[PDB]
Design a protein around this motif. Sequence first.
Motif, PDB file in Angstrom:
ATOM      1  N   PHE A   1      -1.622   9.498   0.916  1.00  0.00           N
ATOM      2  CA  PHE A   1      -1.158  10.657   0.161  1.00  0.00           C
ATOM      3  C   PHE A   1      -0.993  10.321  -1.315  1.00  0.00           C
ATOM      4  O   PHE A   1      -1.366  11.114  -2.188  1.00  0.00           O
ATOM      5  CB  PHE A   1       0.155  11.183   0.761  1.00  0.00           C
ATOM      6  N   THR A   2      -0.438   9.145  -1.620  1.00  0.00           N
ATOM      7  CA  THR A   2      -0.266   8.757  -3.014  1.00  0.00           C
ATOM      8  C   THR A   2      -1.612   8.579  -3.702  1.00  0.00           C
ATOM      9  O   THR A   2      -1.776   8.950  -4.868  1.00  0.00           O
ATOM     10  CB  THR A   2       0.546   7.472  -3.103  1.00  0.00           C
ATOM     11  N   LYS A   3      -2.581   7.987  -3.003  1.00  0.00           N
ATOM     12  CA  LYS A   3      -3.903   7.809  -3.590  1.00  0.00           C
ATOM     13  C   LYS A   3      -4.553   9.158  -3.874  1.00  0.00           C
ATOM     14  O   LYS A   3      -5.207   9.338  -4.911  1.00  0.00           O
ATOM     15  CB  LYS A   3      -4.777   6.961  -2.664  1.00  0.00           C
ATOM     16  N   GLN A   4      -4.378  10.120  -2.966  1.00  0.00           N
ATOM     17  CA  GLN A   4      -4.879  11.471  -3.204  1.00  0.00           C
ATOM     18  C   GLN A   4      -4.212  12.105  -4.418  1.00  0.00           C
ATOM     19  O   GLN A   4      -4.879  12.729  -5.254  1.00  0.00           O
ATOM     20  CB  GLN A   4      -4.635  12.326  -1.962  1.00  0.00           C
TER      21      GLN A   4
ATOM     22  N   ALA B   1       0.793  -1.230   0.000  1.00  0.00           N
ATOM     23  CA  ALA B   1       0.000   0.000   0.000  1.00  0.00           C
ATOM     24  C   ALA B   1       0.837   1.299   0.000  1.00  0.00           C
ATOM     25  O   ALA B   1       0.258   2.379  -0.070  1.00  0.00           O
ATOM     26  CB  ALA B   1      -1.002  -0.054   1.162  1.00  0.00           C
ATOM     27  N   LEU B   2       2.175   1.224   0.038  1.00  0.00           N
ATOM     28  CA  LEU B   2       3.074   2.279  -0.437  1.00  0.00           C
ATOM     29  C   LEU B   2       3.557   1.981  -1.873  1.00  0.00           C
ATOM     30  O   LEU B   2       3.249   2.727  -2.801  1.00  0.00           O
ATOM     31  CB  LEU B   2       4.259   2.464   0.535  1.00  0.00           C
TER      32      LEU B   2
ATOM     33  N   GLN C   1       2.351   4.298  -5.219  1.00  0.00           N
ATOM     34  CA  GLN C   1       3.289   5.210  -5.933  1.00  0.00           C
ATOM     35  C   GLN C   1       3.614   4.713  -7.344  1.00  0.00           C
ATOM     36  O   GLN C   1       3.880   5.563  -8.217  1.00  0.00           O
ATOM     37  CB  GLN C   1       4.586   5.330  -5.141  1.00  0.00           C
ATOM     38  N   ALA C   2       3.630   3.399  -7.553  1.00  0.00           N
ATOM     39  CA  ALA C   2       4.031   2.834  -8.861  1.00  0.00           C
ATOM     40  C   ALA C   2       2.874   2.923  -9.858  1.00  0.00           C
ATOM     41  O   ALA C   2       3.125   3.284 -11.022  1.00  0.00           O
ATOM     42  CB  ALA C   2       4.475   1.409  -8.663  1.00  0.00           C
ATOM     43  N   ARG C   3       1.663   2.551  -9.438  1.00  0.00           N
ATOM     44  CA  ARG C   3       0.503   2.724 -10.349  1.00  0.00           C
ATOM     45  C   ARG C   3       0.448   4.226 -10.549  1.00  0.00           C
ATOM     46  O   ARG C   3       0.135   4.692 -11.675  1.00  0.00           O
ATOM     47  CB  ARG C   3      -0.775   2.213  -9.680  1.00  0.00           C
ATOM     48  N   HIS C   4       0.734   4.936  -9.463  1.00  0.00           N
ATOM     49  CA  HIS C   4       0.838   6.388  -9.556  1.00  0.00           C
ATOM     50  C   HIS C   4       1.781   6.796 -10.680  1.00  0.00           C
ATOM     51  O   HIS C   4       1.501   7.739 -11.417  1.00  0.00           O
ATOM     52  CB  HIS C   4       1.285   7.024  -8.238  1.00  0.00           C
ATOM     53  N   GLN C   5       2.896   6.083 -10.810  1.00  0.00           N
ATOM     54  CA  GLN C   5       3.824   6.342 -11.908  1.00  0.00           C
ATOM     55  C   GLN C   5       3.173   6.130 -13.284  1.00  0.00           C
ATOM     56  O   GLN C   5       3.394   6.916 -14.199  1.00  0.00           O
ATOM     57  CB  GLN C   5       5.101   5.517 -11.754  1.00  0.00           C
ATOM     58  N   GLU C   6       2.358   5.085 -13.423  1.00  0.00           N
ATOM     59  CA  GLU C   6       1.601   4.878 -14.664  1.00  0.00           C
ATOM     60  C   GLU C   6       0.650   6.044 -14.946  1.00  0.00           C
ATOM     61  O   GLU C   6       0.527   6.502 -16.091  1.00  0.00           O
ATOM     62  CB  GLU C   6       0.795   3.582 -14.603  1.00  0.00           C
TER      63      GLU C   6
END
Lengths: 44, 52
Positions: free
Chosen positions: B3-6, A21-22, A26-31
């Motif tokens: 925070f990343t999800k936001q 959940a970190l 952040q990685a899908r976040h990268q996509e």
Amino acid sequence: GQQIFSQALLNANRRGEAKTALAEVQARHQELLKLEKSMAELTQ
Amino acid sequence: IKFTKQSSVASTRNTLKMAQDAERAGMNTLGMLGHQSEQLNNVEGNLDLMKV
């Protein structure tokens, strides 16, 4: 005639899923950031 | 984690916004190219007439 306490232990359960959940946000976040960058160029 | 999800939610919000803006521009451009196509049709007719 006596009495007892209890304890907790955190189990791989979190050793993985909570660390994921970190990493996996952040990685899908990268996509998603990549998507956003491409859409920005396309809109331009 | 949160925070990343936001940040990702914000990313996808701006992403959708930019996509919609792009689409507005594209629709105006296609309609406008159709209008110019009609004008060029008028030009074409006039040129044909002048040839005759």
